[PDB]
Design an enzyme around this catalytic site. Structure first.
Site, PDB file in Angstrom:
ATOM      1  N   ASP A  25       0.716  -1.016  -0.170  1.00  0.00           N
ATOM      2  CA  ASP A  25      -0.158   0.104  -0.068  1.00  0.00           C
ATOM      3  C   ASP A  25       0.928   1.278  -0.086  1.00  0.00           C
ATOM      4  OD1 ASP A  25      -1.823   1.848   0.273  1.00  0.00           O
ATOM      5  OD2 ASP A  25      -2.950   0.868   1.905  1.00  0.00           O
ATOM      6  N   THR A  26       1.222   1.827  -1.222  1.00  0.00           N
ATOM      7  CA  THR A  26       1.792   3.199  -1.344  1.00  0.00           C
ATOM      8  C   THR A  26       1.025   4.295  -0.585  1.00  0.00           C
ATOM      9  OG1 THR A  26       0.943   3.665  -3.430  1.00  0.00           O
ATOM     10  CG2 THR A  26       2.972   2.336  -3.320  1.00  0.00           C
ATOM     11  N   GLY A  27      -0.169   4.323  -0.423  1.00  0.00           N
ATOM     12  CA  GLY A  27      -0.972   5.150   0.245  1.00  0.00           C
ATOM     13  C   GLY A  27      -0.844   5.031   1.849  1.00  0.00           C
TER      14      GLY A  27
HETATM   15  C1  LIG Z   1     -14.726  -0.872   7.211  1.00  0.00           C
HETATM   16  C2  LIG Z   1     -15.212  -1.431   5.839  1.00  0.00           C
HETATM   17  O1  LIG Z   1     -14.203  -1.198   4.878  1.00  0.00           O
HETATM   18  P1  LIG Z   1     -13.698  -2.435   3.735  1.00  0.00           P
HETATM   19  O2  LIG Z   1     -13.330  -3.686   4.252  1.00  0.00           O
HETATM   20  C3  LIG Z   1     -11.959  -1.852   2.907  1.00  0.00           C
HETATM   21  O3  LIG Z   1     -10.971  -1.902   3.852  1.00  0.00           O
HETATM   22  C4  LIG Z   1      -9.796  -1.368   3.487  1.00  0.00           C
HETATM   23  C5  LIG Z   1      -9.235  -0.240   4.243  1.00  0.00           C
HETATM   24  C6  LIG Z   1      -8.041   0.603   4.186  1.00  0.00           C
HETATM   25  C7  LIG Z   1      -7.189   0.314   2.927  1.00  0.00           C
HETATM   26  C8  LIG Z   1      -5.854   1.274   2.317  1.00  0.00           C
HETATM   27  C9  LIG Z   1      -6.428   2.391   2.221  1.00  0.00           C
HETATM   28  N1  LIG Z   1      -7.129   2.442   1.111  1.00  0.00           N
HETATM   29  C10 LIG Z   1      -8.795   2.967   1.058  1.00  0.00           C
HETATM   30  O4  LIG Z   1      -8.984   3.827   1.884  1.00  0.00           O
HETATM   31  O5  LIG Z   1      -9.358   2.850  -0.048  1.00  0.00           O
HETATM   32  C11 LIG Z   1     -10.857   3.209  -0.306  1.00  0.00           C
HETATM   33  C12 LIG Z   1     -10.756   4.057  -1.840  1.00  0.00           C
HETATM   34  O6  LIG Z   1     -10.708   2.855  -2.663  1.00  0.00           O
HETATM   35  C13 LIG Z   1     -11.628   1.650  -1.901  1.00  0.00           C
HETATM   36  O7  LIG Z   1     -10.506   0.577  -2.075  1.00  0.00           O
HETATM   37  C14 LIG Z   1     -10.222   0.186  -0.461  1.00  0.00           C
HETATM   38  C15 LIG Z   1     -10.896   1.023   0.377  1.00  0.00           C
HETATM   39  C16 LIG Z   1     -11.467   1.851  -0.490  1.00  0.00           C
HETATM   40  C17 LIG Z   1      -5.165   3.340   1.827  1.00  0.00           C
HETATM   41  O8  LIG Z   1      -4.481   2.684   0.986  1.00  0.00           O
HETATM   42  C18 LIG Z   1      -4.409   3.797   2.986  1.00  0.00           C
HETATM   43  N2  LIG Z   1      -4.904   4.667   3.904  1.00  0.00           N
HETATM   44  C19 LIG Z   1      -4.195   6.186   3.994  1.00  0.00           C
HETATM   45  C20 LIG Z   1      -4.894   6.945   2.826  1.00  0.00           C
HETATM   46  C21 LIG Z   1      -6.563   7.190   3.129  1.00  0.00           C
HETATM   47  C22 LIG Z   1      -4.263   8.354   2.753  1.00  0.00           C
HETATM   48  C23 LIG Z   1      -4.646   9.032   4.012  1.00  0.00           C
HETATM   49  S1  LIG Z   1      -5.358   4.131   5.393  1.00  0.00           S
HETATM   50  O9  LIG Z   1      -5.764   2.612   5.377  1.00  0.00           O
HETATM   51  O10 LIG Z   1      -6.552   4.631   5.800  1.00  0.00           O
HETATM   52  C24 LIG Z   1      -4.155   4.257   6.749  1.00  0.00           C
HETATM   53  C25 LIG Z   1      -3.952   5.371   7.432  1.00  0.00           C
HETATM   54  C26 LIG Z   1      -2.679   5.603   8.369  1.00  0.00           C
HETATM   55  C27 LIG Z   1      -1.544   4.514   8.406  1.00  0.00           C
HETATM   56  C28 LIG Z   1      -0.439   4.587   9.381  1.00  0.00           C
HETATM   57  O11 LIG Z   1       0.272   5.577   8.584  1.00  0.00           O
HETATM   58  C29 LIG Z   1      -1.793   3.238   7.699  1.00  0.00           C
HETATM   59  C30 LIG Z   1      -3.179   3.146   6.777  1.00  0.00           C
HETATM   60  C31 LIG Z   1      -7.691  -0.647   1.851  1.00  0.00           C
HETATM   61  C32 LIG Z   1      -8.968  -1.528   1.987  1.00  0.00           C
HETATM   62  O12 LIG Z   1     -14.432  -2.387   2.332  1.00  0.00           O
HETATM   63  C33 LIG Z   1     -14.730  -1.204   2.032  1.00  0.00           C
HETATM   64  C34 LIG Z   1     -14.553  -0.978   0.338  1.00  0.00           C
END
Ligand SMILES: CCOP(=O)(COc1ccc(C[C@H](NC(=O)O[C@H]2CO[C@H]3OCC[C@H]32)[C@H](O)CN(C[C@@H](C)CC)S(=O)(=O)c2ccc(CO)cc2)cc1)OCC
Lengths: 99, 99
Positions: A25-27
Site C-alpha cells: 500500500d503506497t498510500g
Molecule cells: C470497514 C469497511 O471497509 P472495507 O473492508 C476496505 O478496507 C480497506 C481499508 C484501508 C485500505 C488502505 C487505504 N485504502 C482506502 O481507503 O481505499 C478506499 C478507496 O478505494 C477503496 O478501495 C479500498 C478501500 C477504499 C489506503 O491505501 C491507505 N490509507 C491512507 C489513505 C487514506 C491516505 C490518508 S489508510 O488505510 O486509511 C491508513 C492510514 C494511516 C496509516 C498509518 O501510517 C496506515 C493506513 C484498503 C481496504 O470495504 C470497503 C470497500
C-alpha cells in the site's frame, strides 16, 4: 518482481512466526496489521483514514519478511480490515512505483 | 518516471481543468478526491475505509491527467482526508509496483 495493479497487490508476509496475506500500500505511511498478540512493549496510537480513526497498538523494530525480502520497523496492530504494508517497510524492500 | 517511497508519492493531477495534488495509492481500489465541483451527472455512492464509510458522489468517465498521463474513468468526490489515485486509474497510466 513486477506487480500489476489490475487486482489488489496482495502478497504473503511472515511476521512473529506467522504467515499472512497483506496489501502492498503506497498510500499508507505506516504498516497496519490485523489483531495478533505479539510479545513485547507497545504504545497506544490512533491512525486515521477514510471513515475516521481507529485505535492501534504500535510495536517498534518488528521484523517482517515480504516475498522473501526482509524489513524491520514499526507495526501498528489493531482492528484493521486488511493487513497493510506501508511505506515504512516498502522502502526497505526496494519497492517503487513505475509508469 | 520511477517513484521511490521515502516520501508520500504525491503528484500533480489535472481534473475538470484544475490542478491539484494527489497520492498514488496502490491500496485504494478506486480514486477518491476531496470536495470539488465537477460538471455532469453523478450518482450517490458509499465507500469504506480504515475508519468506516463515507458518502461520495460518483462521476463516471471523467478525464483526468496524472503526472502528464491521461486517464478517463470513475472519480468519487467526498470527505476523504486526502486526494487519492486508486487502481482504477493507476492501471490506465501503466503504473506497476516493482522491487
Ligand atoms: C470497514 C469497511 O471497509 P472495507 O473492508 C476496505 O478496507 C480497506 C481499508 C484501508 C485500505 C488502505 C487505504 N485504502 C482506502 O481507503 O481505499 C478506499 C478507496 O478505494 C477503496 O478501495 C479500498 C478501500 C477504499 C489506503 O491505501 C491507505 N490509507 C491512507 C489513505 C487514506 C491516505 C490518508 S489508510 O488505510 O486509511 C491508513 C492510514 C494511516 C496509516 C498509518 O501510517 C496506515 C493506513 C484498503 C481496504 O470495504 C470497503 C470497500
Amino acid at each position: 518482481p513486477q506487480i500489476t495493479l489490475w487486482k489488489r497487490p496482495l502478497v504473503t508476509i511472515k511476521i512473529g512466526g506467522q504467515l499472512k496475506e497483506a496489501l502492498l500500500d503506497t498510500g499508507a505511511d505506516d504498516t497496519v496489521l490485523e489483531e495478533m498478540n505479539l510479545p513485547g512493549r507497545w504504545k497506544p496510537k490512533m491512525i486515521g483514514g477514510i471513515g475516521g480513526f481507529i485505535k492501534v497498538r504500535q510495536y517498534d523494530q518488528i521484523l517482517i519478511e515480504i516475498c522473501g525480502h526482509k524489513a524491520i520497523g514499526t507495526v501498528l496492530v489493531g482492528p484493521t480490515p486488511v493487513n497493510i504494508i506501508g511505506r515504512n517497510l516498502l522502502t526497505q524492500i526496494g519497492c517503487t512505483l513505475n509508469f
